[PDB]
Amino acid sequence: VSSFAALRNLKPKKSGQHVLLTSYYDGWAAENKMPTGGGEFISSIGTATDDGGYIAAGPGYYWTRVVNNNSFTAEDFGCKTTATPPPNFNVLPAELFDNTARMQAAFNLAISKSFKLNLSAGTYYFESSDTLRITGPIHIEGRPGTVFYHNPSNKANPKTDAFMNISGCSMGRISSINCFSNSYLGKGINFDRSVGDNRKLVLEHVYVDTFRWGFYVGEPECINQIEFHSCRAQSNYFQGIFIESFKEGQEYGHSAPVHFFNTICNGNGPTSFALGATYKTTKNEYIKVMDSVNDVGCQAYF
Amino acid sequence: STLVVLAQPDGFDSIGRVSSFAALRNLKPKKSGQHVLLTSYYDGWAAENKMPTGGGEFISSIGTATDDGGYIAAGPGYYWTRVVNNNSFTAEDFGCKTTATPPPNFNVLPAELFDNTARMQAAFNLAISKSFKLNLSAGTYYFESSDTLRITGPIHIEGRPGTVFYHNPSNKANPKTDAFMNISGCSMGRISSINCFSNSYLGKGINFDRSVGDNRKLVLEHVYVDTFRWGFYVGEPECINQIEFHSCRAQSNYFQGIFIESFKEGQEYGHSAPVHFFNTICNGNGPTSFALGATYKTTKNEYIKVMDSVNDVGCQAYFQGLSNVQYIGGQLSGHGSPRNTSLATITQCNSFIIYGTDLEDINGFTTDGTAITADNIDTIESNYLKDISGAAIVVSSCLGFKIDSPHIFKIKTLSTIKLM
Amino acid sequence: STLVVLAQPDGFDSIGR
């Protein structure tokens, strides 16, 4: 079978057939690259919810992937990578395909079935009004060169909306990812208790650059016993790490303990260039980066 | 004509398959070197709601070899061997099964009871012998056997969030003290992301021994041990040199979460050294009032009294006869009001150092079993001065003890540190 | 006839490598 859409249109004669899917999209050969996202599928007669990865549905039948070694790749869900842009201020990648909805379907499969998600090198681009959510324990493993690039153009509040939200991820691991935005807007990764506590989550080689805040925590009891190993927060507009369990006049609360091992915060804070900069969105709107002409910051705030 | 059928988009379905591993045992080859496909280890997955598992590709040989139930399927005068990819394989390749995870309540068993002990022993043997990594899937593996599961050499084991090992001690010869899992000789191994529990307050979770050799640089990561009698047990010298615990948890065990005792009184001196704990937690270990009154009902309808005596006490962690021990980060806490003499007890060690560990919530007792309240506090200080009890951390005959400045709270016993 | 050969439990062997 040539592509995932062709698979949706392929009607089986009997439940339990095995077929081969070469690649998720066709036309790799006219380009200069190899097929990706293919695999082996088995048919069933009945109804099921199409997923875009694991399950391909037609009228009265569906096809399910055979998953090997309890793991899969984001390409299995139709995500695409491209060449990485430089870290300069308003610079976007060369091709702009939005991966948010397909990557959300991939995260949902990894949390539901407890498969490990394998990411490849290159940049995944994200330009969506929705935040990417992790809502349970998960294994994610990238490669040296795995990049998540966030465009805040479509967010309802670009300055404060989060790119990625993590909640309830006990005993998970997330390794080898580089998130950056080139905008001085938004939160890189936001931790919440909207699902539960991230009780023994481990982040390893996670890098967050050029947002407004890199790692953000703003409520109690949501990062108990979290661990950061070899992580980096760099060149963010206010702080690299911002943890604030409660504000003035609010009920006391905390999270405890918190462990940082060989993590670096470097270059966070308003520079004179940043103070004067204006961000140009893909809809040709202009967003003033500064809040006030007297902005100051720090590397880490606990 | 037939090539036209084969070249259709669904032509791969016209290739045949072997339906199960037993069918593979009965498949006689015509010639050594044939290749065949095995759909799944067991058949009948389609009548259920779930996908094939444990299949792969096999190659035939003419001769004799010892069957494994995984790697090699043998018949009379021939056999079949799996093709293994990326030097790794899964427990399903050996016929293991998973089921839905029970809640952590006291005498609650899973819904389906298939015993995985002999097949998991075969898989461990293949991983140690050939140096392949073993991949485990989510769900519970159930274990109910008179034999302990043994690891006897260096190994890589990698589970998933939700991988559970459930142990039923009904068939053990001595349920109260028999180990579920024995580790020995595992230098440079790694074991990660496993949750073992028993719901019985009986047995040892993971026992370390020198029956094969030293566990010289074994690394345990995200290994949880719950509701046994002891979570991690060490009971002889020179068997955990340079071991490492990363992000591990021992929780709700009857006496201790961590029990290390190189030698007892009147025995020759010995130790293991160094020992490294990083961000590990022991919590809720010790005899609770429910546990003191509980009785375990076995699958054979026998009743086993959980208590040893009505004055049972415990602690979160117990270290004896060690040297150069570092406890970095982590937590030790008595959540649930178990009866504890202390949170940590240290005896006859050399250089025990605690860096910023979180200590909290102790419900204090003496070694006899006397509750330590305000009303009798003065009496305690007179009559139990020489007892190994009465503090959040009790230190006895330790050279080079050191604790920095952690946050401590809810200490309802006589003192915070006791030195003796 | 050849389809019957290919559909046997050891049919994958008849593919060359």
Side-chain angles (χ1 to χ4, degrees), chain B residues 103-144:
Chain B
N105 307 331
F106 173 55
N107 213 314
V108 172
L109 296 181
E112 302 157 295
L113 312 172
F114 174 81
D115 179 30
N116 294 286
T117 313
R119 300 180 178 271
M120 192 68 65
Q121 190 66 72
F124 285 6
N125 288 347
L126 190 153
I128 297 160
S129 168
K130 283 276 160 55
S131 301
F132 292 154
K133 181 166 81 197
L134 176 50
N135 295 293
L136 306 167
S137 72
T140 73
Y141 302 88
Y142 182 69
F143 293 94
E144 187 198 342

mmCIF file of all heavy atoms in Angstrom, chain B residues 103-144:
data_model
loop_
_atom_site.group_PDB
_atom_site.id
_atom_site.type_symbol
_atom_site.label_atom_id
_atom_site.label_comp_id
_atom_site.label_asym_id
_atom_site.label_seq_id
_atom_site.Cartn_x
_atom_site.Cartn_y
_atom_site.Cartn_z
ATOM 1 N N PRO B 103 -5.803 -3.106 42.486
ATOM 2 C CA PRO B 103 -5.495 -2.026 43.436
ATOM 3 C C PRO B 103 -4.562 -2.509 44.534
ATOM 4 O O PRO B 103 -4.447 -3.718 44.780
ATOM 5 C CB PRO B 103 -6.873 -1.663 44.009
ATOM 6 C CG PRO B 103 -7.654 -2.945 43.892
ATOM 7 C CD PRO B 103 -7.192 -3.584 42.611
ATOM 8 N N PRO B 104 -3.917 -1.598 45.240
ATOM 9 C CA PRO B 104 -2.989 -1.980 46.316
ATOM 10 C C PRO B 104 -3.631 -2.369 47.652
ATOM 11 O O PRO B 104 -2.965 -2.326 48.689
ATOM 12 C CB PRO B 104 -2.125 -0.724 46.493
ATOM 13 C CG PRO B 104 -2.417 0.141 45.285
ATOM 14 C CD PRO B 104 -3.808 -0.175 44.886
ATOM 15 N N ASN B 105 -4.905 -2.730 47.665
ATOM 16 C CA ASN B 105 -5.529 -3.155 48.905
ATOM 17 C C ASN B 105 -4.976 -4.514 49.360
ATOM 18 O O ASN B 105 -4.301 -5.217 48.610
ATOM 19 C CB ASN B 105 -7.039 -3.194 48.714
ATOM 20 C CG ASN B 105 -7.575 -1.873 48.181
ATOM 21 O OD1 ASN B 105 -7.004 -0.811 48.440
ATOM 22 N ND2 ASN B 105 -8.669 -1.933 47.432
ATOM 23 N N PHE B 106 -5.262 -4.873 50.617
ATOM 24 C CA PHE B 106 -4.530 -5.920 51.331
ATOM 25 C C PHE B 106 -4.564 -7.290 50.661
ATOM 26 O O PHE B 106 -3.537 -7.750 50.169
ATOM 27 C CB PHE B 106 -5.044 -6.047 52.770
ATOM 28 C CG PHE B 106 -4.459 -7.213 53.534
ATOM 29 C CD1 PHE B 106 -3.101 -7.360 53.660
ATOM 30 C CD2 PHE B 106 -5.285 -8.158 54.138
ATOM 31 C CE1 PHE B 106 -2.559 -8.438 54.345
ATOM 32 C CE2 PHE B 106 -4.749 -9.237 54.836
ATOM 33 C CZ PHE B 106 -3.390 -9.380 54.932
ATOM 34 N N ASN B 107 -5.687 -7.975 50.582
ATOM 35 C CA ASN B 107 -5.628 -9.354 50.094
ATOM 36 C C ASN B 107 -6.133 -9.495 48.656
ATOM 37 O O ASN B 107 -6.711 -10.525 48.307
ATOM 38 C CB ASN B 107 -6.439 -10.238 51.039
ATOM 39 C CG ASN B 107 -5.881 -11.632 51.188
ATOM 40 O OD1 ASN B 107 -5.525 -12.285 50.206
ATOM 41 N ND2 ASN B 107 -5.850 -12.118 52.419
ATOM 42 N N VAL B 108 -5.940 -8.478 47.810
ATOM 43 C CA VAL B 108 -6.589 -8.407 46.503
ATOM 44 C C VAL B 108 -5.647 -8.977 45.449
ATOM 45 O O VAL B 108 -4.511 -8.508 45.304
ATOM 46 C CB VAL B 108 -6.994 -6.964 46.158
ATOM 47 C CG1 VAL B 108 -7.476 -6.868 44.718
ATOM 48 C CG2 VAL B 108 -8.090 -6.482 47.090
ATOM 49 N N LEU B 109 -6.125 -9.982 44.693
ATOM 50 C CA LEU B 109 -5.407 -10.617 43.594
ATOM 51 C C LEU B 109 -5.888 -10.080 42.256
ATOM 52 O O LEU B 109 -7.009 -9.573 42.145
ATOM 53 C CB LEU B 109 -5.622 -12.129 43.618
ATOM 54 C CG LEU B 109 -5.094 -12.905 44.811
ATOM 55 C CD1 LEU B 109 -5.393 -14.393 44.643
ATOM 56 C CD2 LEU B 109 -3.627 -12.668 44.904
ATOM 57 N N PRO B 110 -5.083 -10.187 41.199
ATOM 58 C CA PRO B 110 -5.563 -9.774 39.874
ATOM 59 C C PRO B 110 -6.691 -10.677 39.397
ATOM 60 O O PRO B 110 -7.059 -11.669 40.034
ATOM 61 C CB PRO B 110 -4.324 -9.870 38.980
ATOM 62 C CG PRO B 110 -3.345 -10.685 39.741
ATOM 63 C CD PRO B 110 -3.649 -10.518 41.189
ATOM 64 N N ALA B 111 -7.269 -10.291 38.259
ATOM 65 C CA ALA B 111 -8.459 -10.969 37.751
ATOM 66 C C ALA B 111 -8.124 -12.316 37.118
ATOM 67 O O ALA B 111 -8.885 -13.278 37.272
ATOM 68 C CB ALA B 111 -9.178 -10.069 36.746
ATOM 69 N N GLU B 112 -7.007 -12.406 36.398
ATOM 70 C CA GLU B 112 -6.548 -13.648 35.790
ATOM 71 C C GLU B 112 -5.234 -14.082 36.424
ATOM 72 O O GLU B 112 -4.327 -13.265 36.615
ATOM 73 C CB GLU B 112 -6.349 -13.481 34.287
ATOM 74 C CG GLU B 112 -7.588 -13.035 33.549
ATOM 75 C CD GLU B 112 -7.263 -12.350 32.227
ATOM 76 O OE1 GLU B 112 -6.644 -11.260 32.248
ATOM 77 O OE2 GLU B 112 -7.634 -12.903 31.167
ATOM 78 N N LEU B 113 -5.120 -15.373 36.722
ATOM 79 C CA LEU B 113 -3.972 -15.901 37.455
ATOM 80 C C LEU B 113 -3.227 -16.937 36.599
ATOM 81 O O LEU B 113 -3.410 -18.144 36.759
ATOM 82 C CB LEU B 113 -4.454 -16.495 38.772
ATOM 83 C CG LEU B 113 -5.412 -15.631 39.607
ATOM 84 C CD1 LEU B 113 -5.933 -16.432 40.774
ATOM 85 C CD2 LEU B 113 -4.759 -14.363 40.116
ATOM 86 N N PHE B 114 -2.341 -16.451 35.730
ATOM 87 C CA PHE B 114 -1.417 -17.282 34.964
ATOM 88 C C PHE B 114 -0.016 -17.063 35.522
ATOM 89 O O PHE B 114 0.438 -15.920 35.606
ATOM 90 C CB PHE B 114 -1.463 -16.930 33.470
ATOM 91 C CG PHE B 114 -0.434 -17.662 32.652
ATOM 92 C CD1 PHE B 114 -0.668 -18.958 32.237
ATOM 93 C CD2 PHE B 114 0.767 -17.065 32.309
ATOM 94 C CE1 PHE B 114 0.272 -19.649 31.505
ATOM 95 C CE2 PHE B 114 1.721 -17.757 31.574
ATOM 96 C CZ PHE B 114 1.471 -19.048 31.173
ATOM 97 N N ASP B 115 0.670 -18.145 35.891
ATOM 98 C CA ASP B 115 1.968 -18.053 36.557
ATOM 99 C C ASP B 115 3.093 -17.924 35.537
ATOM 100 O O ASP B 115 3.311 -18.833 34.730
ATOM 101 C CB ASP B 115 2.193 -19.277 37.441
ATOM 102 C CG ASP B 115 3.541 -19.254 38.151
ATOM 103 O OD1 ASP B 115 4.064 -18.161 38.445
ATOM 104 O OD2 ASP B 115 4.076 -20.353 38.424
ATOM 105 N N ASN B 116 3.840 -16.817 35.605
ATOM 106 C CA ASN B 116 4.877 -16.519 34.625
ATOM 107 C C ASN B 116 6.280 -16.915 35.084
ATOM 108 O O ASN B 116 7.253 -16.515 34.435
ATOM 109 C CB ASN B 116 4.881 -15.016 34.291
ATOM 110 C CG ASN B 116 3.612 -14.548 33.576
ATOM 111 O OD1 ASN B 116 3.411 -14.822 32.395
ATOM 112 N ND2 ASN B 116 2.764 -13.827 34.288
ATOM 113 N N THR B 117 6.428 -17.652 36.192
ATOM 114 C CA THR B 117 7.750 -17.784 36.823
ATOM 115 C C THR B 117 8.726 -18.552 35.949
ATOM 116 O O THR B 117 9.897 -18.162 35.816
ATOM 117 C CB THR B 117 7.638 -18.481 38.173
ATOM 118 O OG1 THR B 117 6.569 -17.905 38.927
ATOM 119 C CG2 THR B 117 8.960 -18.323 38.965
ATOM 120 N N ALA B 118 8.287 -19.681 35.381
ATOM 121 C CA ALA B 118 9.211 -20.525 34.633
ATOM 122 C C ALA B 118 9.590 -19.891 33.303
ATOM 123 O O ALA B 118 10.752 -19.973 32.872
ATOM 124 C CB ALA B 118 8.593 -21.904 34.423
ATOM 125 N N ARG B 119 8.636 -19.226 32.646
ATOM 126 C CA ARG B 119 8.937 -18.553 31.381
ATOM 127 C C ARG B 119 9.787 -17.304 31.580
ATOM 128 O O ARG B 119 10.659 -16.998 30.747
ATOM 129 C CB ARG B 119 7.639 -18.232 30.666
ATOM 130 C CG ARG B 119 6.875 -19.501 30.376
ATOM 131 C CD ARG B 119 5.591 -19.203 29.668
ATOM 132 N NE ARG B 119 4.864 -20.422 29.344
ATOM 133 C CZ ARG B 119 5.030 -21.107 28.220
ATOM 134 N NH1 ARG B 119 5.903 -20.681 27.318
ATOM 135 N NH2 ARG B 119 4.321 -22.205 27.996
ATOM 136 N N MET B 120 9.573 -16.564 32.668
ATOM 137 C CA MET B 120 10.448 -15.417 32.923
ATOM 138 C C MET B 120 11.840 -15.876 33.323
ATOM 139 O O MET B 120 12.831 -15.223 32.981
ATOM 140 C CB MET B 120 9.830 -14.523 33.994
ATOM 141 C CG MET B 120 10.461 -13.128 34.181
ATOM 142 S SD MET B 120 10.238 -11.938 32.816
ATOM 143 C CE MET B 120 8.465 -11.647 32.783
ATOM 144 N N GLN B 121 11.954 -17.011 34.024
ATOM 145 C CA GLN B 121 13.284 -17.558 34.281
ATOM 146 C C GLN B 121 13.976 -17.928 32.984
ATOM 147 O O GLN B 121 15.177 -17.659 32.821
ATOM 148 C CB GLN B 121 13.188 -18.771 35.194
ATOM 149 C CG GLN B 121 14.540 -19.235 35.682
ATOM 150 C CD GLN B 121 15.197 -18.211 36.577
ATOM 151 O OE1 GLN B 121 14.767 -18.029 37.710
ATOM 152 N NE2 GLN B 121 16.238 -17.522 36.070
ATOM 153 N N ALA B 122 13.247 -18.522 32.026
ATOM 154 C CA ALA B 122 13.881 -18.835 30.734
ATOM 155 C C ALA B 122 14.353 -17.576 30.018
ATOM 156 O O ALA B 122 15.445 -17.554 29.436
ATOM 157 C CB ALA B 122 12.917 -19.615 29.848
ATOM 158 N N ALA B 123 13.533 -16.516 30.031
ATOM 159 C CA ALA B 123 13.916 -15.253 29.391
ATOM 160 C C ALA B 123 15.128 -14.605 30.057
ATOM 161 O O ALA B 123 16.026 -14.109 29.363
ATOM 162 C CB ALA B 123 12.723 -14.286 29.401
ATOM 163 N N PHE B 124 15.182 -14.586 31.400
ATOM 164 C CA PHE B 124 16.385 -14.100 32.099
ATOM 165 C C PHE B 124 17.615 -14.901 31.711
ATOM 166 O O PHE B 124 18.714 -14.337 31.583
ATOM 167 C CB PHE B 124 16.227 -14.199 33.620
ATOM 168 C CG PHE B 124 15.322 -13.155 34.219
ATOM 169 C CD1 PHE B 124 14.619 -12.287 33.403
ATOM 170 C CD2 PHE B 124 15.152 -13.062 35.597
ATOM 171 C CE1 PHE B 124 13.764 -11.322 33.940
ATOM 172 C CE2 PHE B 124 14.295 -12.098 36.141
ATOM 173 C CZ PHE B 124 13.598 -11.230 35.299
ATOM 174 N N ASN B 125 17.475 -16.231 31.604
ATOM 175 C CA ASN B 125 18.606 -17.061 31.194
ATOM 176 C C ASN B 125 19.087 -16.691 29.802
ATOM 177 O O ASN B 125 20.294 -16.617 29.555
ATOM 178 C CB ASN B 125 18.221 -18.542 31.247
ATOM 179 C CG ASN B 125 18.096 -19.060 32.670
ATOM 180 O OD1 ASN B 125 18.519 -18.390 33.619
ATOM 181 N ND2 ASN B 125 17.554 -20.271 32.829
ATOM 182 N N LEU B 126 18.167 -16.428 28.871
ATOM 183 C CA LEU B 126 18.610 -16.025 27.527
ATOM 184 C C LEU B 126 19.311 -14.668 27.546
ATOM 185 O O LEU B 126 20.285 -14.454 26.823
ATOM 186 C CB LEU B 126 17.430 -15.985 26.570
ATOM 187 C CG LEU B 126 17.853 -15.808 25.109
ATOM 188 C CD1 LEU B 126 16.807 -16.426 24.329
ATOM 189 C CD2 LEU B 126 17.868 -14.359 24.706
ATOM 190 N N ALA B 127 18.791 -13.717 28.326
ATOM 191 C CA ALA B 127 19.383 -12.374 28.361
ATOM 192 C C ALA B 127 20.773 -12.377 28.983
ATOM 193 O O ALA B 127 21.654 -11.628 28.550
ATOM 194 C CB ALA B 127 18.478 -11.428 29.137
ATOM 195 N N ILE B 128 20.981 -13.165 30.035
ATOM 196 C CA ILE B 128 22.318 -13.263 30.610
ATOM 197 C C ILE B 128 23.257 -14.028 29.675
ATOM 198 O O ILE B 128 24.419 -13.654 29.508
ATOM 199 C CB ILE B 128 22.230 -13.922 31.996
ATOM 200 C CG1 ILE B 128 21.406 -13.043 32.955
ATOM 201 C CG2 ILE B 128 23.624 -14.195 32.540
ATOM 202 C CD1 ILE B 128 20.865 -13.815 34.157
ATOM 203 N N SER B 129 22.782 -15.117 29.061
ATOM 204 C CA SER B 129 23.676 -15.962 28.262
ATOM 205 C C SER B 129 24.123 -15.274 26.982
ATOM 206 O O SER B 129 25.311 -15.276 26.649
ATOM 207 C CB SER B 129 22.986 -17.277 27.918
ATOM 208 O OG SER B 129 23.728 -17.952 26.925
ATOM 209 N N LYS B 130 23.180 -14.706 26.223
ATOM 210 C CA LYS B 130 23.503 -14.136 24.920
ATOM 211 C C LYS B 130 23.815 -12.648 24.970
ATOM 212 O O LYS B 130 24.254 -12.098 23.954
ATOM 213 C CB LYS B 130 22.350 -14.368 23.951
ATOM 214 C CG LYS B 130 22.267 -15.770 23.418
ATOM 215 C CD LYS B 130 23.199 -15.932 22.245
ATOM 216 C CE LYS B 130 23.497 -17.401 22.005
ATOM 217 N NZ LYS B 130 22.247 -18.183 21.830
ATOM 218 N N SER B 131 23.592 -11.990 26.110
ATOM 219 C CA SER B 131 23.751 -10.538 26.270
ATOM 220 C C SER B 131 22.825 -9.757 25.340
ATOM 221 O O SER B 131 23.250 -8.852 24.621
ATOM 222 C CB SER B 131 25.204 -10.107 26.066
ATOM 223 O OG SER B 131 26.070 -10.751 26.988
ATOM 224 N N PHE B 132 21.540 -10.113 25.370
ATOM 225 C CA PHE B 132 20.465 -9.353 24.750
ATOM 226 C C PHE B 132 19.737 -8.554 25.824
ATOM 227 O O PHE B 132 19.644 -8.989 26.974
ATOM 228 C CB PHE B 132 19.461 -10.286 24.064
ATOM 229 C CG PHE B 132 20.006 -10.990 22.872
ATOM 230 C CD1 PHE B 132 19.482 -12.192 22.469
ATOM 231 C CD2 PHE B 132 21.034 -10.438 22.147
ATOM 232 C CE1 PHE B 132 19.982 -12.839 21.372
ATOM 233 C CE2 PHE B 132 21.543 -11.078 21.049
ATOM 234 C CZ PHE B 132 21.015 -12.280 20.658
ATOM 235 N N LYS B 133 19.207 -7.396 25.454
ATOM 236 C CA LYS B 133 18.394 -6.631 26.380
ATOM 237 C C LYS B 133 16.981 -7.191 26.446
ATOM 238 O O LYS B 133 16.393 -7.542 25.424
ATOM 239 C CB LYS B 133 18.335 -5.170 25.963
ATOM 240 C CG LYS B 133 17.517 -4.322 26.913
ATOM 241 C CD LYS B 133 17.740 -2.821 26.700
ATOM 242 C CE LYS B 133 16.935 -2.255 25.548
ATOM 243 N NZ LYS B 133 17.482 -0.919 25.124
ATOM 244 N N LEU B 134 16.409 -7.237 27.640
ATOM 245 C CA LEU B 134 15.054 -7.722 27.815
ATOM 246 C C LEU B 134 14.094 -6.539 27.963
ATOM 247 O O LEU B 134 14.263 -5.711 28.860
ATOM 248 C CB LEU B 134 14.983 -8.619 29.043
ATOM 249 C CG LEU B 134 13.640 -9.158 29.479
ATOM 250 C CD1 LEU B 134 12.951 -9.768 28.319
ATOM 251 C CD2 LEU B 134 13.872 -10.228 30.554
ATOM 252 N N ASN B 135 13.069 -6.482 27.112
ATOM 253 C CA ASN B 135 12.051 -5.438 27.159
ATOM 254 C C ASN B 135 10.750 -5.982 27.722
ATOM 255 O O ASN B 135 10.178 -6.925 27.169
ATOM 256 C CB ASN B 135 11.772 -4.878 25.769
ATOM 257 C CG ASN B 135 12.947 -4.176 25.188
ATOM 258 O OD1 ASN B 135 13.363 -3.123 25.674
ATOM 259 N ND2 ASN B 135 13.494 -4.737 24.122
ATOM 260 N N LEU B 136 10.246 -5.355 28.775
ATOM 261 C CA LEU B 136 8.988 -5.756 29.386
ATOM 262 C C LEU B 136 7.898 -4.756 29.018
ATOM 263 O O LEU B 136 8.182 -3.586 28.761
ATOM 264 C CB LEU B 136 9.143 -5.832 30.897
ATOM 265 C CG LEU B 136 10.283 -6.712 31.385
ATOM 266 C CD1 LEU B 136 10.492 -6.417 32.836
ATOM 267 C CD2 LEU B 136 9.945 -8.186 31.168
ATOM 268 N N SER B 137 6.649 -5.218 28.959
ATOM 269 C CA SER B 137 5.545 -4.348 28.575
ATOM 270 C C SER B 137 4.723 -3.963 29.802
ATOM 271 O O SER B 137 4.912 -4.503 30.889
ATOM 272 C CB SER B 137 4.654 -5.032 27.532
ATOM 273 O OG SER B 137 3.913 -6.065 28.135
ATOM 274 N N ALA B 138 3.805 -3.011 29.633
ATOM 275 C CA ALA B 138 2.942 -2.603 30.739
ATOM 276 C C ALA B 138 1.937 -3.705 31.065
ATOM 277 O O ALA B 138 1.725 -4.634 30.286
ATOM 278 C CB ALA B 138 2.208 -1.308 30.402
ATOM 279 N N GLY B 139 1.300 -3.600 32.232
ATOM 280 C CA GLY B 139 0.431 -4.649 32.749
ATOM 281 C C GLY B 139 1.130 -5.410 33.857
ATOM 282 O O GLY B 139 2.307 -5.179 34.154
ATOM 283 N N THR B 140 0.410 -6.348 34.497
ATOM 284 C CA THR B 140 1.028 -7.129 35.556
ATOM 285 C C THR B 140 1.418 -8.488 35.018
ATOM 286 O O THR B 140 0.644 -9.147 34.319
ATOM 287 C CB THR B 140 0.128 -7.398 36.751
ATOM 288 O OG1 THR B 140 -0.852 -8.373 36.394
ATOM 289 C CG2 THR B 140 -0.601 -6.167 37.079
ATOM 290 N N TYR B 141 2.617 -8.913 35.387
ATOM 291 C CA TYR B 141 2.961 -10.309 35.333
ATOM 292 C C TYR B 141 2.691 -10.925 36.698
ATOM 293 O O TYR B 141 3.187 -10.438 37.714
ATOM 294 C CB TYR B 141 4.422 -10.470 34.942
ATOM 295 C CG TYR B 141 4.769 -9.843 33.612
ATOM 296 C CD1 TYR B 141 5.162 -8.516 33.518
ATOM 297 C CD2 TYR B 141 4.758 -10.594 32.454
ATOM 298 C CE1 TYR B 141 5.493 -7.944 32.274
ATOM 299 C CE2 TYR B 141 5.091 -10.044 31.230
ATOM 300 C CZ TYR B 141 5.467 -8.737 31.149
ATOM 301 O OH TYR B 141 5.791 -8.228 29.907
ATOM 302 N N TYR B 142 1.920 -11.992 36.719
ATOM 303 C CA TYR B 142 1.596 -12.695 37.946
ATOM 304 C C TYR B 142 2.610 -13.804 38.205
ATOM 305 O O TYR B 142 3.085 -14.447 37.270
ATOM 306 C CB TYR B 142 0.202 -13.276 37.803
ATOM 307 C CG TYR B 142 -0.326 -14.000 38.985
ATOM 308 C CD1 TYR B 142 -0.653 -13.329 40.148
ATOM 309 C CD2 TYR B 142 -0.556 -15.360 38.925
ATOM 310 C CE1 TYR B 142 -1.166 -14.007 41.230
ATOM 311 C CE2 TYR B 142 -1.059 -16.048 40.000
ATOM 312 C CZ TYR B 142 -1.376 -15.366 41.139
ATOM 313 O OH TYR B 142 -1.879 -16.069 42.206
ATOM 314 N N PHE B 143 2.950 -14.028 39.472
ATOM 315 C CA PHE B 143 3.938 -15.042 39.836
ATOM 316 C C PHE B 143 3.434 -15.819 41.043
ATOM 317 O O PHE B 143 3.193 -15.229 42.099
ATOM 318 C CB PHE B 143 5.284 -14.403 40.173
ATOM 319 C CG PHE B 143 5.969 -13.759 39.003
ATOM 320 C CD1 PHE B 143 5.810 -12.425 38.735
ATOM 321 C CD2 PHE B 143 6.796 -14.487 38.192
ATOM 322 C CE1 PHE B 143 6.449 -11.849 37.677
ATOM 323 C CE2 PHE B 143 7.431 -13.902 37.135
ATOM 324 C CZ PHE B 143 7.259 -12.591 36.884
ATOM 325 N N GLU B 144 3.294 -17.133 40.910
ATOM 326 C CA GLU B 144 2.889 -17.925 42.072
ATOM 327 C C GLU B 144 3.572 -19.286 41.959
ATOM 328 O O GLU B 144 3.022 -20.223 41.379
ATOM 329 C CB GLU B 144 1.381 -18.064 42.136
ATOM 330 C CG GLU B 144 0.882 -18.723 43.407
ATOM 331 C CD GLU B 144 -0.543 -19.235 43.267
ATOM 332 O OE1 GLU B 144 -1.245 -18.787 42.327
ATOM 333 O OE2 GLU B 144 -0.958 -20.091 44.086
#
